[PDB]
Symmetry: none
Subunit: 166 residues, 12 copies
């Protein structure tokens, strides 16, 4: 009974609350007012796509983001953020699969990849169970929390996701 | 039947948007793709006087929203258009499709003065094919792997009817 | 009937204008711009509100029932001519309002606007309407061949006119 | 009558202005822009609200009944001239208000606006109105031939004027 | 004559369009908007450049001399009808170009635009033009009484039409 | 003289219009808006370019010398009347151009615009101009008392008119 | 004299601005203060059709820029205005002031139909006072510490002339 | 009287401002823009709300009766001068309020705004008002000839001033 | 022939584009917008310069003679399909250029744009063109009845397609 | 032969070059584009006034700035920046006096003050010779060049400047 | 039992009433105002602007006690100007000392400012001495800084750092 | 004797000509283009944008040798993607090694970046080995990352830090 729907102007508050550097179509923002202007400017821009996750009661569960969508290579970077109060409920698995379903059955993308902190082996293992495979171990990629950290780059291909049960 | 067609209004956009949320494919408004209601609303404002597409919402006697009749790719030199009909899930199986197809043809051929109406229908939907055939549509093409629908490329029939045939 | 009034069209009357077309199975225009939806009509109304090339009057009775519409379009102020149309709401047809409204339209055209010529089009397949306009003093000046695509075929229309001098000397 | 007041026209008075024309079978203008509908009038009112070329006063009685309208148009501040018109609502005609209102209009024109000349047009076929304006001190300066198309034919109008000096002596 | 060409009107042709009216003693329109000056015409051209309701073709000879103008106006894409006009520059009249250009206009209307009906207006006092259009296959469908004020009086015009089918048989 | 032409006013003619006033010691208006500077005139020209309430024609000779201006203002399309003015450039006065231009203006007014009445104002202190207009068929319909403040005092003007029917039956 | 007045144009703003650069006080355009050419230019665009002030640039036969005649605070009910004249430094002492004052009065009283023209003149400039007196201006006020000019508050004469007096 | 207060003008006071001009038989201005109607006044109020060239104070008594208006106009912050006007509502004239309000206006002008000079205009045909301003310390600096067209003729006005240094004393 | 090049269309090529339609007797479109004049075309070019729904390549020889135009229109990046058209200038027809240019268009479509399907329309009354496309590997998928009004009558067109997998080989 | 004139749009390049945090009417900027937008927005705003200094050849010598102008208290803060190539030529004295002249004879201000680094005793002494007096020694007022620094606040009054020779 | 909370739209009335006593010109983000309507427009314009921060002081019963204002907050130099206004009715209860300390606490432990300064009339030596007891030191004697009540007046500028407050 | 200088408007022609060889889609600040006209509009739009930096390589005679590109410059993580294009005519002169070192020098001694990475076709093991000799190490083998020349291809992502380059 979790649903995905396309992000709307009314969801910006939630997007902003999910954050505290944030970017919208590669443009940095800190304030709600900045976010709102960026939302208006990029509303029809296809390079990124966002889906808010809701439950049956329309509680805001989290966000599915595809960014860096390239329509020649047919690839995109995926990110998922679950609101603090809804973590640990097993929603992540379902939402990952919904995102892949949309990416591969509707957008007709070829490759979805993501980055995950090496220091978060629980998330790594979860993505692995969803069929993602490590293709890189990026050394000191990001400055997070006072130090450079390694990230795994993990991918899954369209043909692999769509035939999993065949 | 007590079913009516009326020209689409701004207040009907919610219904249009909800009609796609069920659907497989990606939606377009005047050939511009959209996913959200906000996108749809901006596209509606931009194309309000544009003649290349025409939409009619279907209502019953009680003003229940039954479905949508769409003419797209209207060309006024060749006098042709592509037709689509979407019936809301709760109103399928009630035999409305036949009536609505005929209403669309009536409007196309007696009011718009078009020469040709065509449509696309999934080869994997032989029931719909046969229904359009009974309405007088004939296959003019079997389009190979035309659309990516539901995880694979699918064939569609292109089916047409001409003004002279419908008006006799 | 004596108790029918004409008043200048207002924004609040657009609903009525729009409902008047929903019967008719022809395409509607507002200052030569086509529309089908109320939303389209409303935008066209806002754009052309001070434009004098067309003039519209809604017809009401004593109780403010909406009776119909008198339209002058293609008003040209050099040639002093206009095309006249009247639409009576379905529920008010057959009551003898047509004759009164035709005369009101002519009165306004010829005694206030100072136009020289009013013309109209009427379906050849509607000889009853033709004869009614003839009794109001209109004369045929054209039989336009396959002028309009109406109801699945091209149809002929009569063009009928009356001149200011003829109406004012009746 | 002594109890009639003039006050500057407000947005809320537009309905009354519009109703005053619906009787009249002539074409109305607002700052030289023609209108027939209330909606047209309202847009014209918003556009010209600070424009000085015309000035309008609604006439009320002690109970705030709407009596009529005093209009100065074509106000030119170099030549110091203006065209005056008065409309009295049908229900308030024949009560002798016209004389008082004409004098109020002249008073405002000549003692406050400091205009030099007020003129008006009056249908030649309305000799009663002509004579009334003559008693208020207006004099004919023109007989305009077929000036206006009114009611199915071209009609002649008198142009009548009065100067500031003459109106400010008539009371001395 | 065989060597006359039609091409779509461009901004640079507006001077020629404007000069073509300066002869004519009638009031000109561009997409139903009246104009007298070149400056007015130029603004109207910019505003209506993508508007389909009218279509204009300038006629040139082999040397690119400006011969005249073919105009389709009031194009309606439901009824599939249009009003046709032709203007030949004074220096190029009497050379037999009219017949050829009428046929070019009809050709484009009926074989490319897929219109159903072309009509035109012609002064009753110009029976030579009437007869020329009749030879091109146009038939009178109206005699419009005092339709236009031209040259100091109201004048009658013939409305003449030709249908797509009939024009596409005349050559078979 | 036969070789004088009228053509519709263009943006490039504004300089000439402006220079024509610099002689005259009256205040100039463009569509009822006052101006003194060329810059003001230019803005007013841009604003009113499609407005039909006034019409202007610059008069040229065979060599394209700028001869003067024919102006119709206050054009009302219900009453079918307009006010006419003519300004001849100082260097071209006294050459008998006035009569020709008056007749051209009337011709355009009455045979093309289809107006019913043309009127004008002429200083009572200029009886020569009065008599010239009288010979062109204008008749006095008003003697307007202290109408204009001109040159340090209020002055009377004649209002003079001619009707379409009178001009066309000459 | 061969001196002419013409209505101020956008191209004259440079000259207007240069005329103040010499001057003591702070400049105003339609009662808005300005210091730079850019400020002046924006103020000129904003007030181009505003009648409350009128300006005329003075030129000689060769189109040398001689000075400026300014009417400000024009009130069309009371029919009064404040007059100022500025002659460019290189053209002072040539006796132009008298002619230009008379031109300004002529325009004010024979064309604008104003009733009263007044001006302010520094009490510490008795030469200018006497010149205006010869042009027919009379003192109607001695305004005490009216303006801060050159490091101190200064008195000014207010001087006027009426239309009826000038036209006789 | 001691119990009269000044407060800064608000949108809700516009009705009172408008009513105040109705008997006055002259033309009203708001930041040099003429108006006759309330609708005009309201638009002018919205446009000039933060403009400092004029300052207005409505006068109230202890019961919040609307007593009148104190206006400073033509405030120039280089020359440090302003024109002062006071309007007392007809029903509150003759109660001796004028003197107190003049002094309040001067107080605000000279102790808070730090202006150097306050001036006013008063009809020569109103010698009572002249004498009142003289008692408040204003002195005639001009007799302006036919300055204003008032009530059918041109009239003379006195211009009267007082300086900050004169109004402010001393110990 | 080997010496023919494709390059992306530029503003300076619009004259050539416009000249190409003049003999063709059909109505031209630019990003689905109709035009007849060069001025219209130029405005449409400015408006759609970064729009990816259509892609155009002008064909030149070694001497920079303008040979013709390769057009992909209706490019859809979900379904990965496009409609292909080629126009060869009258003076360069019959030189065997068509085959080479068709193959260049397919190459670009399938090896660079990564499209899945290319289709085209060809007049049934032009069986020579049909057969040429067939030799390039296109197959008929439809016979569209009275699809277009061309030259005074409704005409049938073949819709012909080729897929990326078929065009791309293998080792 | 040094002149002051009101700052113009054409002088913005020079203003920008004179800098490298900069403010325009209390709004921060780093780029020329930002400065230009701020200039357009505040062109008629009276709270600050700027004068570019030129020589006879129209070389750009420096900038005189009055900021925080308050028209009730009649005070303003003064700053002067001389372009590097024109320092050491004795221009500062002349320009200070021109600024004071404008402030006191044209603007009719009552008080001009400025801040000067305690670590710049040469500038202190120069302002003292122009008639400025210390009214404050502001402790660790500004973070400049890696540490908090003290500044002198120095003032001069209208009546003192205008009567200096009397 | 005094609390500080961030200023809200509903507190504007109180802000405005706090000035109606005080014979000075009021400012909002350096913009002058006299009327409530002016204040309200200025509040809407500057709502997200960080250069000033205001805290309304309430007691246990939610009586409006006064206002703590930090203005001219500069986040490079890490300094701010502090002012406190106690409503006439709550003066004399020794709330000034407590509120000064609350303001310093917020400035130095939460905002992480380096320096707080204030201005105090030289003619008010009692207030000077009070600030001195709160740890403020004179760093300037500003000559004829403000026109207040009919004459130019001197003010002390007083500061404290934080390192001094936290130790 | 090779020099790097910042890209100017006049260098766009060269940039455009450098792609006309190369059977890939070109991007400018992540925006695709094929024509010079498109490139020129993109250049005007992004002229002050810091996310990419380009240097044209010239020899002593001012022959245009090639291009050094830093893209995806992130100033928080202090990383950038590096690419180098040598014009067909100057290949085989061993300029690649020199230019790689120049790019690293600029990245690490002037921009103060922490990490430089690049992508190289797995089907180009010669280029892989060259970057390895310049001190780059493989950190990823990206599976079917790019559609190039009719098929999906794998690329190595290779990086150098920085500390490693400067020591």
């Amino acid at each position: 009974q979790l649903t995905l729907r396309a992000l709307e102007r009314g969801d910006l508050r939630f997007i902003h609350n999910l954050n505290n550097m944030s970017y919208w179509f590669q443009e940095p923002y800190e304030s709600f007012d900045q976010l709102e202007e960026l939302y208006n400017k990029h509303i029809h821009d296809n390079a990124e796509r966002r889906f808010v996750v809701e439950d049956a009661q329309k509680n805001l569960i989290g966000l599915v983001e595809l960014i860096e969508i390239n329509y020649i290579h047919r690839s995109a970077e995926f990110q998922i953020i679950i609101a603090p109060e809804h973590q640990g409920k097993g929603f992540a698995r379902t939402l990952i699969n919904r995102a892949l379903d949309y990416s591969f059955t509707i957008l007709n993308l070829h490759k979805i990849y993501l980055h995950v902190a090496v220091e978060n082996p629980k998330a790594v293992h979860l993505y692995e169970e969803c069929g993602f495979v490590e293709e890189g171990h990026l050394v000191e990629e990001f400055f997070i929390n006072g130090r450079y950290q390694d990230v795994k780059r993990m991918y899954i291909l369209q043909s692999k996701y769509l035939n999993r049960s065949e």
